[PDB]
Amino acid sequence: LDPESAHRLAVRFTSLGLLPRARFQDSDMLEVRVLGHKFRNPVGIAAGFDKHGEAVDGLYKMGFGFVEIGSVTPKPQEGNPRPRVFRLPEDQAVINRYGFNSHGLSVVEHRLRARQQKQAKLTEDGLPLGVNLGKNKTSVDAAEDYAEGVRVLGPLADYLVVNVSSPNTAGLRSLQGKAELRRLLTKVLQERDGLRRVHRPAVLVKIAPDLTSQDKEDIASVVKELGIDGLIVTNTTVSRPAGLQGALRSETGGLSGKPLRDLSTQTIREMYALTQGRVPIIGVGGVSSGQDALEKIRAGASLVQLYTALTFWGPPVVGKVKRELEALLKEQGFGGVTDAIGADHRR
Ligand SMILES: Cc1cc2nc3c(=O)[nH]c(=O)nc-3n(C[C@H](O)[C@H](O)[C@H](O)COP(=O)(O)O)c2cc1C
Ligand SMILES: Cc1c(Oc2c(F)cccc2F)c(OC(C)C)nn1-c1ncc(C2CC2)cc1F
Ligand SMILES: O=C(O)c1cc(=O)[nH]c(=O)[nH]1
């Protein structure tokens, strides 16, 4: 099985509930209140596993405390030619250049509408839903693509993600620069504020691990100025850290998994400091263990996500991360996850 074939089968099996229901019962230690919601546990599935919102209920069954679908583009688009996903088994890493393959807003809108009240119950029970918004390859006006996403899927989401950090769409990461970023996020927040109160989601910005010090300072400034609700830190890296062994290490695309882990943790640490710990962070990149999760929480993450670990450990990795995180919190004298958020910054 090539990686993309495995991905398609994984989504199909998850959607059909063909996996053991997670025996691990979440303790009160793992509960987090952030972004106006209760999260039963802080371990989410990152964007790019369920791009088209086909497997949401199966992912809650796997034991995730929250699910992020997408990225979703306004119009349907095929993304890049195959092959476009590469396994680096020696590195516990993946390189992908999917290029925002998307069923598009209308198809995803109808899928989420079909289970909207089921989701309202799950959200009330501490299992929220995120929607990650992308832009079409041929789009002239990036802000209008994101605005369309807010209008169509904002009403169906607990939080929205403005993905300005895909490495696989020409000119996208340049939306991370200051004057353009202020214009883009002002338009996104105006559109969000225009939705009816019960349909009004939190808005987060998802950033690359590949930003300059200047880029990070500029993002922190704009996020505080505009009242952005949170940051997702980080997307995949276009860097190739020294020591990658995989034969496929020089494939074009975003690198995920263990080689991204500490680059992502350091970006969390920097963004927490630049926002004075006042901007909730979802920490993501190379999480495979309770230790990986707690390092991101101590660096300033309120929640974490994983993806690549699923491809090396399978579905059991979710319960593993939760059980190890609970054990480490007890060992280090934390009452719960909330007490550990940003603990490294208090020395
Ligand atoms: C195959 C693949 C597809 C992805 N697609 C998306 C996407 O559509 N939108 C997005 O924001 N991030 C996407 N990501 C990035 C993940 O959400 C996450 O930020 C990154 O993989 C780091 O987490 P991990 O090391 O636990 O996989 C994708 C990652 C992979 C491996
Ligand atoms: C998470 C996941 C599986 O694990 C399972 C499961 F073994 C049973 C049910 C659900 C699952 F997710 C799996 O099982 C293969 C189909 C045997 N593949 N896989 C996987 N997922 C995503 C990708 C992305 C391209 C990078 C690649 C993959 F290999
Ligand atoms: O669709 C993709 O190529 C994709 C998008 C994104 O945000 N991140 C990633 O690694 N791949």
Closest CA to 58 of 102, 16, 9: 16
Q: Are 28 and 336 in contact (CB under 8 A)?
A: yes
What span, in angstroms and rounded, lies between the C-alpha atoms of 105 and 148? 8
Q: Say yes or no: CB of residue 96 within 6 Å of ligand 1.
A: yes
Instruction: Give the mutation target among 1, 11, 59, 311 for probing the ligand 2 site: most ligand atoms within 8 A of CB.
Output: 311
Ligand 2 centroid to Cα of residue 6, in Å, is: 5
Coil, strand or helix at 203: strand
* Ligand 1 atom, smallest distance to 256 CA: 25
What span, in angstroms and rounded, lies between the C-alpha atoms of 97 and 107? 23
Q: Are 58 and 309 in contact (CB under 8 A)?
A: no
Q: Is 257 annotated as a binding residue?
A: yes
Q: Is 51 annotated as a binding residue?
A: yes
For 41, phi then psi, to 5°, come to -145, 160
Q: What kind of experiment solved this structure? A: X-ray
Domains observed in the chain: 1-346 (3.20.20.70)
- Of 166, 256, 288, 289, which one is the catalytic site residue? 166
Whose structure tokens read 């949401």?
56
Q: How far is CA 284 from the centre of its chain?
A: 7
Q: Are 156 and 56 in contact (CB under 8 A)?
A: no
Q: Which residues contact 256 (CB under 8 A, 6 or more apart)?
A: 93, 94, 95, 96, 236, 285, 286, 307, 308
Residue 199 DSSP class: G
Q: What is the DSSP string of 52-103?
A: TSSSHHHHHHHT-SEEEEEEE-SS-B--SPSP-EEEEGGGTEEEE-----B-
Quick one: resolution in A? 1.8
Closest CA to 131 of 204, 195, 62: 204
* Ligand 1 atom, smallest distance to 258 CA: 25
What span, in angstroms and rounded, lies between the C-alpha atoms of 250 and 224? 37
- Ramachandran category for residue 71: left, alpha or beta (phi over 0 → left; psi -120 to 50 → alpha): beta
Return the residues preceding each gap in the chain, C–N over 2.5 A, or none.
Answer: none
**Residue with CA closest to ligand 1 atom 21:** 256
Coil, strand or helix at 164: coil
Which ligand is closest to the CA of 87, given by its number?
A: 2
Ligand 3 centroid to Cα of residue 341, in Å, is: 27
Closest CA to 41 of 281, 319, 343: 319
Q: How far is CA 160 from the centre of its chain?
A: 10
Coil, strand or helix at 147: helix
**Residue with CA closest to ligand 1 atom 5:** 48
In the chain, the N- to C-terminal Cα span, in Å, equals 47
Closest CA to 195 of 230, 149, 240, 235: 149
Active site residue 166: yes
Q: Say yes or no: CB of residue 135 within 6 Å of ligand 1.
A: no
Whose structure tokens read 């020089």?
250
